[PDB]
Ligand binder design. Structure first.
Ligand SMILES: *[C@@H]1O[C@H](CO)[C@@H](O[C@@H]2O[C@H](CO)[C@@H](O[C@@H]3O[C@H](CO)[C@@H](O)[C@H](O)[C@@H]3O)[C@H](O)[C@H]2NC(C)=O)[C@H](O)[C@H]1NC(C)=O
Length: 486
């Protein structure tokens, strides 16, 4: 029942690894393999299931699959025109050496959120497999992943995705025919057991929905992996064709997950073995994919499907943790901090970084209780700190290092003053339209995120141009300036 569950996890992890010891569509399918991880498939299964959200509020699968599109036509071509090897390069030359390090901290935080999401998904899967508590399972998974990252001493992304694709598409047909599950064509409009899974956006929340969509479709462009892969390709048309293939792949991958949420929503949980309380009354509603894959499906198929899905995700953490640790070692720390790989220095620092990243990721995975919340917050700080300047480096002329600090502080001021519902923080500026959610944390209905980004943008050029006239004639001697961008 339970102890055989470990064999299911172990037997697949080897195959995904031994085969890792061993025409252009492979590029598209390995670009699709960065975004479709352990959050997509589990968060967009949450968004449909939770009452009061529905499909209309599951804006992330559409958001990222459109960010991959808007990247190719507009950002891919003009980056290659000046030969930037990576996203770090444009910040270094025109904003100086050190500002590049300080402009990558929000990216590190975003990667920390993303890493926490995978730990959260893995914990739930292991918990349903062997009936252990969440509080222990996520810790165990974090320990295993962090240890294997450094004690471990080739197409690994292709294999992991071709296991998820088969695993989900083999169980969903069988669950949909279960006696408990009813017609899915009627519970999308007339609420047989719970509110219809096809969501709604009222006249009040239009601005909030548009603001979230802009945040979540314009905050995926400046990520590191996409711009690393696009820049490497030899042909410019090759890059955009790969981008469109990746968008298509994500859209096709987003179909099995939606059906799982609908199956979970349209079910009579009093007839199956989950008891009278629904997964919503008991605050266990992120487990919707594992729950429907285990209880509704028969014995043999669940043993294949759940094991394959878990083992596919297990190989995602090793890439992300190591990439973020190397990121911290080289871009945030080493720049202008002269050290070499000696006894007490950078490689020891990178060894230590892995432990801190794992501990922070699991600590935040334990505190927050929603995967979709983490996979939403992973695209906020980047959206409001990096993209506003990434626009000005590429197209705007005359941006100086002076302008960067003003926008940096101005956007963060409005963002942290606004407050967050997911992470418990109470607003301080109290934008009009605020209403209480749960008698506790207040929630605002004003596009303060987009307002903050736009304000950062319009101060970046303004103060930067002010400095240029400030350092020429009539107002200020040139000598007394901390930096010299003139
Ligand atoms: C799903 O829920 C239904 C109803 O909530 C459960 O069915 C009911 O189970 C009770 C338990 O013995 C049956 O006994 C009845 O109890 C009431 C209590 O007042 C009594 O007044 C009746 O004379 C009778 O003894 C009841 O007949 C039964 N009702 C139906 C329509 O089946 C059911 O057990 C739950 N679980 C499932 C279906 O897996």
């Amino acid at each position: 029942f339970h102890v055989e569950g470990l064999i299911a996890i172990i037997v697949f992890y080897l195959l995904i690894l031994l085969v890792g010891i061993w025409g252009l569509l492979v590029g598209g399918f390995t670009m699709t393999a960065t975004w479709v991880g352990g959050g997509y498939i589990n968060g967009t299964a949450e968004a449909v299931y939770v009452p009061g959200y529905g499909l209309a509020w599951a804006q992330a699968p559409i958001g990222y699959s459109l960010s991959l599109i808007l990247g190719g036509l507009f950002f891919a071509k003009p980056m290659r025109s000046k030969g930037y090897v990576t996203m770090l390069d444009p910040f270094q030359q025109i904003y100086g050496k050190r500002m590049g390090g300080l402009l990558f901290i929000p990216a590190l935080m975003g990667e920390m959120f993303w890493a926490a999401a995978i730990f959260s998904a893995l914990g739930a899967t292991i918990s349903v497999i062997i009936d252990v508590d969440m509080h222990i399972s996520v810790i165990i998974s974090a320990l295993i992943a962090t240890l294997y990252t450094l004690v471990g001493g080739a197409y690994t992304d292709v294999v992991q995705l071709f296991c998820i694709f088969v695993g989900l598409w083999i169980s969903v047909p069988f669950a949909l025919s279960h006696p408990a599950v009813a017609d899915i064509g009627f519970t999308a409009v007339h609420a047989k057991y719970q509110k219809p899974w096809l969501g709604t956006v009222d006249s009040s929340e239009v601005y909030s929905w548009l603001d979230s969509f802009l945040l979540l479709m314009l905050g995926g462009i400046p990520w590191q992996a996409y711009f690393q892969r696009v820049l490497s390709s030899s042909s410019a048309t090759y890059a955009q064709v790969l981008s469109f293939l990746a968008a298509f792949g994500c859209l096709v991958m987003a179909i099995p997950a939606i059906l799982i949420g609908a199956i979970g929503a349209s079910t009579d949980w009093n007839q199956t073995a989950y008891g009278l309380p629904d997964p919503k009354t008991t605050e266990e509603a992120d487990m919707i994919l594992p729950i429907v894959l285990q209880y509704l499906c028969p014995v043999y198929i669940s043993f294949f499907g759940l094991g394959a899905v878990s083992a596919a995700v297990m190989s995602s953490a090793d890439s992300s943790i190591l990439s973020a640790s190397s990121m911290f070692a080289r871009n945030i720390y080493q720049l202008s901090f002269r050290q070499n790989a000696s006894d007490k220095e950078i490689v020891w620092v990178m060894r230590i970084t892995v432990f801190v990243f794992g501990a922070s990721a699991t600590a935040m995975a334990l505190l927050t209780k929603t995967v979709y919340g983490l996979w939403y917050l992973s695209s906020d700080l980047v959206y409001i700190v990096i993209f506003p300047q990434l626009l000005c480096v590429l197209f705007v002329k005359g941006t100086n290092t002076y302008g960067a600090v003003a926008g940096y502080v101005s956007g963060l001021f409005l963002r942290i003053t606004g407050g967050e519902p997911y992470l418990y923080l109470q607003p301080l500026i109290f934008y009009p339209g605020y209403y209480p959610d749960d008698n506790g944390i207040y929630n605002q209905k004003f596009p303060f995120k987009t307002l903050a980004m736009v304000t950062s943008f319009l101060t970046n050029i303004c103060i930067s141009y002010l400095a240029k006239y400030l350092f020429e004639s009539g107002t200020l001697p040139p000598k007394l300036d901390v930096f010299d961008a003139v």
